[PDB]
Design an enzyme around this catalytic site. Structure first.
Site, PDB file in Angstrom:
ATOM      1  N   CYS A   8      10.146   9.441  -1.038  1.00  0.00           N
ATOM      2  CA  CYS A   8       9.634  10.810   0.014  1.00  0.00           C
ATOM      3  C   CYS A   8       8.845  11.806  -1.367  1.00  0.00           C
ATOM      4  CB  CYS A   8      10.576  11.130   0.880  1.00  0.00           C
ATOM      5  SG  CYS A   8      10.334  12.498   1.871  1.00  0.00           S
ATOM      6  N   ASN A  20       9.667   4.785   3.661  1.00  0.00           N
ATOM      7  CA  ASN A  20      10.146   3.884   4.515  1.00  0.00           C
ATOM      8  C   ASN A  20      10.508   3.172   4.105  1.00  0.00           C
ATOM      9  OD1 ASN A  20       6.878   3.854   4.969  1.00  0.00           O
ATOM     10  ND2 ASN A  20       6.974   3.475   2.727  1.00  0.00           N
ATOM     11  N   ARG A  28       0.787  -1.428   0.232  1.00  0.00           N
ATOM     12  CA  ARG A  28      -0.234  -0.107  -0.069  1.00  0.00           C
ATOM     13  C   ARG A  28       1.139   0.887  -0.241  1.00  0.00           C
ATOM     14  NH1 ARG A  28      -0.839   4.822   2.437  1.00  0.00           N
ATOM     15  NH2 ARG A  28      -0.398   3.782   4.346  1.00  0.00           N
ATOM     16  N   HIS A  37      10.015   6.292   8.719  1.00  0.00           N
ATOM     17  CA  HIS A  37      10.971   6.617   7.403  1.00  0.00           C
ATOM     18  C   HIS A  37      12.533   6.929   7.292  1.00  0.00           C
ATOM     19  CE1 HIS A  37       7.239   7.863   4.840  1.00  0.00           C
ATOM     20  NE2 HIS A  37       7.159   7.022   5.473  1.00  0.00           N
TER      21      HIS A  37
HETATM   22 NA    NA Z   1       4.625   6.087   5.169  1.00  0.00          NA
END
Ligand code: NA
Ligand code: NA
EC number: 4.1.3.26
Lengths: 300, 300
Positions: free
Chosen positions: A240, A249, A15, A209
């Site tokens: 990002c 991530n 996701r 992150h």
């Molecule tokens: Na995230």
């Protein structure tokens, strides 16, 4: 130390990873991803999202993914549900858990979603109510927990406040999201201490992150504070928006490597996890975003 | 915590980084690198090596680099000296500090340099003696401190033994090198505890490769044990032979980011450090190997 003996890896690759990749992929490959992740022994996978594919083509076909995956009985297959119609579509797909979201920064709230923190929390009451009626559990994400891309410093009491609102709305678990990757190990521990004044560690997860290379040290610092749930993306999918698509991530294999090294139980098999990440990166492909995975692949 | 208030960053970019890059570069660019690093406020830079350029073309012209750099008086400009003739060449260049090396693994010693641990330590006695005569201080590196690419597990008492031999030979500081990047935060702390039984923390440094994404968490774990010297490579120059050129040294900007975040004094300026890394990567170039540097560059 004082470390957890057992930790939950929350796999957000399908996701949050796929969503933040530039290349949308076929439903058949998403199904294979999730199936490979289930084969890796993960007990929590964020399968897809019922955001409007109009805005996020990467998430199109989520329903078909849910219908196609081999769902193992002890595993939660969660979906993002950003509003009521998204929740209803998730319901139609037999989704047993959804995630909602909030921000610790007013400035970030205004920019990201065009309303205040309270406005967005209130917007989610209807979906909490409907999920409660259908016994669908709801996870709550918070963004900017360790700093905001507009405002800079985020007071940890402010994060504590939103964590409290989310748990009191009916979220069973709150995921603390260093969503620009700016946090460091000490501020991370102070954040956990402030939030734990309002919501117990057992309803807390770390969503770190790796944009500034800090994610694993943050996780280690979190472990030292007794946090035992961490969100990660297999093979480090994808990036990002605040750092022109650079690392988003933390990578799941990197985290698993740490956890295996600490001899902490996760139930997750590295070889199978790496295998899942390899296959999806080739589909993308995308060089593997996991250092540990690359090193292990090179070694073999 | 219990953390150091002050930490030394040992910048190995120009030697260990450049050495492990595939592309050799011009002496003029190496000089600029070192000068940019001196401008960043670093007080320790490994400038080059007096290994035979026959074997390592990347290190050719080290003497010319030493002659060309603007050397600041409070800064140590060190060089690798792998044998006596290398030491003598370093002497000819006005080098005030050299580094020698050893391994914690017999198997790795045989493979990397075709002799045992003892053979290589004895080989270095002559250079320790000559350095002692010319008052050139010697730093000692150990490889495989957290695992060996051939043998697997490395007992920390074995590392402690070689650390002790090195200090007793006249090395003023021992750098503990996780030179395949396989170590994790807990084994790192146990390693420091075992080594500190033989050599005090104040003569210890951490040399952590980031090949498995573990380096910063290892550094944080090291900080928790009171280690206050860490070796890093600006912009993450360059890689690992055991992982087909994937990440080698931890990146200096990543470490500085941690240390700044912990409010630990290093004397190093991030903007200037990032600037130095940017310039050399363009010369290479090579996308910046530092996550923190990329993120900061994207932000600006
Ligand atoms: Na995230
Ligand atoms: Na090295």
């Amino acid at each position: 130390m004082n470390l957890p003996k057992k930790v939950r890896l929350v796999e957000v690759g399908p996701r949050d990873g796929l969503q933040n990749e530039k290349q949308p992929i076929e439903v058949a490959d998403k199904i294979r991803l999730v199936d490979d992740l289930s084969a890796a022994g993960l007990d929590y996978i964020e399968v897809g999202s019922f955001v409007s594919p109009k805005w996020v083509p990467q998430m199109a076909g989520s329903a078909e993914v849910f219908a196609g995956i081999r769902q193992r009985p002890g595993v939660t297959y969660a979906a993002l549900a950003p509003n009521l119609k998204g929740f209803e579509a998730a319901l139609e797909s037999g989704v047993k858990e959804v995630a909602v979201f909030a921000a610790a920064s007013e400035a970030f709230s205004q920019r990201n979603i065009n309303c205040s923190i309270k406005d967005s929390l209130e917007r989610f009451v209807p979906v909490l109510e409907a999920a409660r009626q259908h016994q669908v559990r709801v996870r709550g994400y918070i963004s900017c927990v360790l700093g905001c891309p507009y405002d800079g410093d985020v007071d940890p009491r402010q994060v504590a406040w939103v964590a409290r609102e989310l748990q009191q709305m009916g979220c069973y678990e709150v995921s603390l999201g260093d969503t620009i990757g700016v946090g460091t190990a000490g501020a991370t521990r102070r954040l956990i201490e402030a939030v734990a004044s309002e919501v117990p560690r057992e309803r807390l997860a770390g969503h770190f992150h790796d944009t500034y290379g800090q994610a694993l040290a943050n996780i280690y610092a979190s472990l030292l504070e007794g946090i035992a749930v961490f969100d990660s993306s297999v093979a480090g999918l994808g990036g990002c928006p605040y750092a022109k698509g650079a690392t988003g991530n933390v990578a799941s294999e990197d985290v698993l490597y740490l956890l295996n090294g600490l001899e902490i139980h996760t139930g997750v098999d590295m070889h199978a996890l790496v295998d899942a990440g390899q296959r999806i990166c080739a589909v993308l492909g995308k060089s593997n975003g996991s250092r540990a995975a690359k090193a292990l692949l090179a070694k073999a």
